[model samples]
Target: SLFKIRMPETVAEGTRLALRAFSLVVAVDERGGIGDGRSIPWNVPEDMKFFRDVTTKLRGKNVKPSPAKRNAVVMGRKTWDSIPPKFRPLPGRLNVVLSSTLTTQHLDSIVAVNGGLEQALQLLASPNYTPSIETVYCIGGGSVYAEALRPPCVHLLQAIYRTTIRASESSCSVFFRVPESGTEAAAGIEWQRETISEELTSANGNETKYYFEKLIPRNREEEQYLSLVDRIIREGNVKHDRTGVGTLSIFGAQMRFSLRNNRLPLLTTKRVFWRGVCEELLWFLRGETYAKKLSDKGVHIWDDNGSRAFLDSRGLTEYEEMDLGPVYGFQWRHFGAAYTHHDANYDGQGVDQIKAIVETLKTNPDDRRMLFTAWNPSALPRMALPPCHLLAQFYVSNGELSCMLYQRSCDMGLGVPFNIASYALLTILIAKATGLRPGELVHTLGDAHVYSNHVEPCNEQLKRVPRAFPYLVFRREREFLEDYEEGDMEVIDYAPYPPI
Candidate 1:
């Protein structure tokens, strides 16, 4: 039997999709490796044309059949606009631009769709599409790619383009493959595909090019976090405390200690979930009363909040069953709000609140009430969600104020690093606010484990040795909050490492 090779419908379309997807994945993954402008070449015109040609020929052939049911091509705003006006409607496809900032102006000509990448992908996978439409092409800027590609069923048609291009002071090459071989086949393997073109010479220049199509694997850290969360939801028990707030119990509070010289407890098993964690922290800090903002950013950690205080505040009784109320941030900011007589006992101001707490530690080192809770019981009935890093306590010993964070849930793949950076920064911030030196940060995570899906990437990370912490030098001694600029903090003597 003669072997048949598959190709895409229009090479240009395929190439555009490939490059767009690649760019989107790189931009969103936050891993050092994927889309660092220095590592991937997005500027090769001839290679792009070749990718387009190959994909166009392979369309509806051996490749995953494009869904002709949905008439939409969901893409980022800039990406959607980048499609030439002549191809605005994408011939037979309807163009849907997915943007967090969609406006009426764009909606007039384009359907301004607003949803996280995961929700959008689920929509595409739904069978309710019109038969006249084919598959929805998830064209990209960044976030779209990261969310879309992380799943297992998603097939990637990569035109690897082996040509090397000048990227600032370094030369870079692009590589791709299916989910069966290469990186995808290894234990904890994620992505896989095949090389369709190998170092084909560029017609316009002497440079050689190569192309590959594969399914890239999800990082192990991501897999681990998801698995742990799923387990907690399945086997965990819930306890209602005196505050009328509840705690999900999988295991009782436990403490483990690492040597002081080790790297901060940032997870090595996955790419840290930065956006969700950061935005969520910011929401708590800002005392946001609703989940609309965080949910808008694709974070669902506060979904419980929407049911409780969120709905009740609007006079809706329907969602009261799911209310978690202001349990974490309230306690952190204002403890026991119901007791008006204890007004003097509350320290809810700004840094002064923490300062007073620290002073109390210096005077009375054994105070257990030194713990701060962001969750407020009185407010929980109206809160969007209970806090995650729920309650934290400061320990004052030998002149150092050591802080330990108790995280009820952690997406090690996505949320760990941001947790580290944020808490570490917070520790420093509190120390500065209290006129005491900062000490160690102890992070205690319940059910810490990697997802079955992301084991390989986690192992890869373990192989990486820690490089020296780059010395961060501030040009001026002025307060960082008031004076810091883009140029204020510089990393000295930095060496290159594989992109995360």
Candidate 2:
């Protein structure tokens, strides 16, 4: 049975506590599997007085809930089953469940039901739902807790249970902090600051914890850089600079350029690990049998001798152990691995695989499975460094196949320009091979940043407007089909601002 309490003391505090409690109930239900077959057998008389005292103290405060009013109370199927039959028809508040097979027949009133957490949240928040509550309260079973906490919204409340019973003595203390906004101050004393002891006889026998904090913004500079990078990839021109480095410091503390449209962004800006990146790509494509083969080809990017070793003591190569898995190669060759069963098969330099990808787009443009992945979690520990441009996916619409690259890490001043160009070229090549129109390249970065050391050079580079890219005319379009020589493609009349 549920108890209701009313307050008459500090109305503001009471209202705040009510909302806080409401949020807590939502969090607990969302995060804990309580009422989901596991009955909470609390001392009802004690809780009753406690609720009354809390409500009595919070009587007159005006509490403005979230404007979105998309708020919902989510419970598990098991927990919903436990509610008394009489209360099932009660209206006014939206109650939802995260269950695949739940039916409306089970409850007299239910705002919605869903099989997945994402779908449930989306439906609850949609404009079609009458009440526009901004936040959701999850009440629980293990599934609800896992889902609700995963998104960083459900606040945690920890209560220390101290008892003399030997069976209860085995109980361990649970430590948790709530979403920061839920913390409260009463009569100049912060309840969140109160402490309890192990001694059962003391007034503070059991510690009552409250929501003390919420997620706060951090690393603003990195966030700003990401935004800038997104804009540049969307709008900037690809150009060649004879001096090698093109400046993008006006956007952030970094130099950047579109490599496909501009050939010089690789050589003109800073000395890049051109041979190394290419060699690494080649090594994966070749399906090198051993580290020695990769090292022989001068692809030593993963040969760092540190806490983690890409190569074993005897140095026999294993992609998972050595961390040199064919991640990027796999994505470029087999995008189906993202959604379906597929293995890494680079038997023929992935050329045929690339051709197949283009053909797939030409045939099946509406497939959502048109995605790629390069970040092999299995190879992370052995890799000297994780792949920056990790995964990419293509979308074909309006006779054009647009590509979106998902980069897990980025060096704004150093790696981004080359990455941009490499992927753009890949897109152009794919478009040419598939006879599809070339569309914009979309680059999404997880950790887009400009190192502190590159700030000065980036500032100087931003002083001038970037130079226009030069045209590259193929000397022999016929030879491009046969030997594929670099001499076939030549840049003409290119000039760019010198690197700071």
Candidate 1 C-alpha error for residue 370, in Å = 1.7
Q: What are the runs in model 1 whose C-alpha is more than 4 Å off? A: 1-327, 338-356, 362-368, 375-378, 468-500
Error of 1 at 100 (Å): 56
Clashes of each: 78, 39
lDDT digits (tens) for residues 167-216 of candidate 1: 23222222222234345433334442323334344454545343333223
- Sliding window of 10 residues with minimal summed lDDT for model 1: 11-20
The lDDT of each candidate is 0.43, 0.42
Best by lDDT: 1
Model 2 stretches with alpha carbons more than 4 Å out: 1-327, 334-356, 379-385, 476-488, 492-494
TM-score of each candidate?
A: 0.37, 0.38
